[PDB]
Amino acid sequence: MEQPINVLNDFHPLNEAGKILIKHPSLAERKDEDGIHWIKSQWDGKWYPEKFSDYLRLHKIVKIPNNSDKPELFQTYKDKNNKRSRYMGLPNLKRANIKTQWTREMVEEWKKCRDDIVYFAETYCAITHIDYGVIKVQLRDYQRDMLKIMSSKRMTVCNLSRQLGKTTVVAIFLAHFVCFNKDKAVGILAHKGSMSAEVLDRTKQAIELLPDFLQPGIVEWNKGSIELDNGSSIGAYASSPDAVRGNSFAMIYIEDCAFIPNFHDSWLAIQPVISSGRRSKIIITTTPNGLNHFYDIWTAAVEGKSGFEPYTAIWNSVKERLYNDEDIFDDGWQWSIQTINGSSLAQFRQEHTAAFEGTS
Ligand SMILES: Nc1ncnc2c1ncn2[C@@H]1O[C@H](COP(=O)(O)OP(=O)(O)O)[C@@H](O)[C@H]1O
Numbered sequence: 001m002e003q004p005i006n007v008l009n010d011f012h013p014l015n016e017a018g019k020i021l022i023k024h025p026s027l028a029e030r031k032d033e034d035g036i037h038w039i040k041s042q043w044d045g046k047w048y049p050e051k052f053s054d055y056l057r058l059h060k061i062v063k064i065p066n067n068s069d070k071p072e073l074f075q076t077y078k079d080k081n082n083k084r085s086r087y088m089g090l091p092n093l094k095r096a097n098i099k100t101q102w103t104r105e106m107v108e109e110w111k112k113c114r115d116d117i118v119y120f121a122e123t124y125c126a127i128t129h130i131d132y133g134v135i136k137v138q139l140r141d142y143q144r145d146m147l148k149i150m151s152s153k154r155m156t157v158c159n160l161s162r163q164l165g166k167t168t169v170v171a172i173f174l175a176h177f178v179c180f181n182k183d184k185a186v187g188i189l190a191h192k193g194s195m196s197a198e199v200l201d202r203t204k205q206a207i208e209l210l211p212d213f214l215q216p217g218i219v220e221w222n223k224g225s226i227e228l229d230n231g232s233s234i235g236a237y238a239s240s241p242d243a244v245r246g247n248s249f250a251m252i253y254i255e256d257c258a259f260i261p262n263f264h265d266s267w268l269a270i271q272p273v274i275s276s277g278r279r280s281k282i283i284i285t286t287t288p289n290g291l292n293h294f295y296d297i298w299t300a301a302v303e304g305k306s307g308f309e310p311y312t313a314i315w316n317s318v319k320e321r322l323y324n325d326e327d328i329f330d331d332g333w334q335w336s337i338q339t340i341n342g343s344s345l346a347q348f349r350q351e352h353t354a355a356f357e358g359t360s
Contacts, residue, residue, distance in 0.1 A: 022333065023042050063136070074106050113176075179214065258287065
């Protein structure tokens with residue numbers, strides 16, 4: 001008699017010791033509904049089609065309609081043929097302080113966007129599909145959750161894994177913040193100034209695609225900063241105490257925090273910003289880098305010893321990873337095995353499970 005009767009013959013590197021971190025897909029619940037077979041994921045308790053083709057089939061592909069002829073259709077309208085209303089002859093950008101008359105429906109739609117960030121994202125924001133092109137973005141569950149937390153909490157710290165598409169959500173969040181709030185100065189901080197310029201560029205792209213009624217008039221449009229007619233702005237900087245002390249930000253966004261050398265002095269300088277009577281917002285996102293400064297920030301948040309709300313999302317947040325090479329749902333069994341085998345458990349734990357190398 002070899003291994004017992006009812007013991008699965010498939011093993012996974014992640015279950016390297018008595019601890020089952022990933023359950024075999026054959027043990028999951030299954031059901032038939034809507035004419036197809038479904039399997040329940042162990043990661044979120046949600047149902048997924050057995051076939052990747054159906055997973056793709058069930059997603060809506062809607063292009064961002066190009067409408068520059070019918071104002072009545074204000075939701076998709078952008079007056080780019082009339083370069084008089086344009087900024088620097090730019091067809092996608094709206095000109096500042098331009099007197100415009102609105103209808104009742106337009107005011108309500110604008111308010112709806114101001115108060116429902118998720119609705120704003122999936123109705124007026126996009127991503128570039130490989131073959132379909134520029135279409136409206138359908139947020140991943142973690143992106144929807146992240147957007148909601150960043151908007152509802154004054155300070156948020158996100159411990160994320162790599163390649164989750166987080167820049168897309170950050171861009172939408174910043175675009176939303178400056179478009180629906182007045183006189184708010186936003187500062188983007190990163191290890192290198194070039195990194196912050198990239199975040200700013202992604203945010204500029206989102207604003208550019210917005211219809212006339214949602215897009216604020218453009219006052220300034222540089223590679224290092226922008227200013228809108230509502231008085232809000234965004235600037236890209238290299239993290240340092242001087243960058244923090246040198247401006248009065250309503251919001252500071254820090255990119256890849258755990259990989260910023262000597263961040264401690266920047267963190268120190270941010271304490272007065274946090275405790276200021278102006279109630280500034282602070283958003284931090286990063287993947288782990290051992291037991292350094294970020295580990296301390298994260299731990300305080302998780303233990304409730306700071307004003308920061310913690311948020312985390314790991315590798316299984318990207319659902320395409322839950323289908324194998326034969327386009328069959330396997331809850332990420334194969335993807336994780338190949339990723340670990342192609343690197344190592346240590347690298348996978350840090351890079352994809354958001355674990356802190358600096359062991360407990
Ligand atoms: N909800 C989504 N639906 C479809 N594609 C997405 C989504 N979020 C991100 N992406 C795509 O993932 C790609 C890489 O993500 P990006 O936003 O650059 O962040 P990161 O580089 O950290 O993954 C982008 O080209 C983007 O089009």
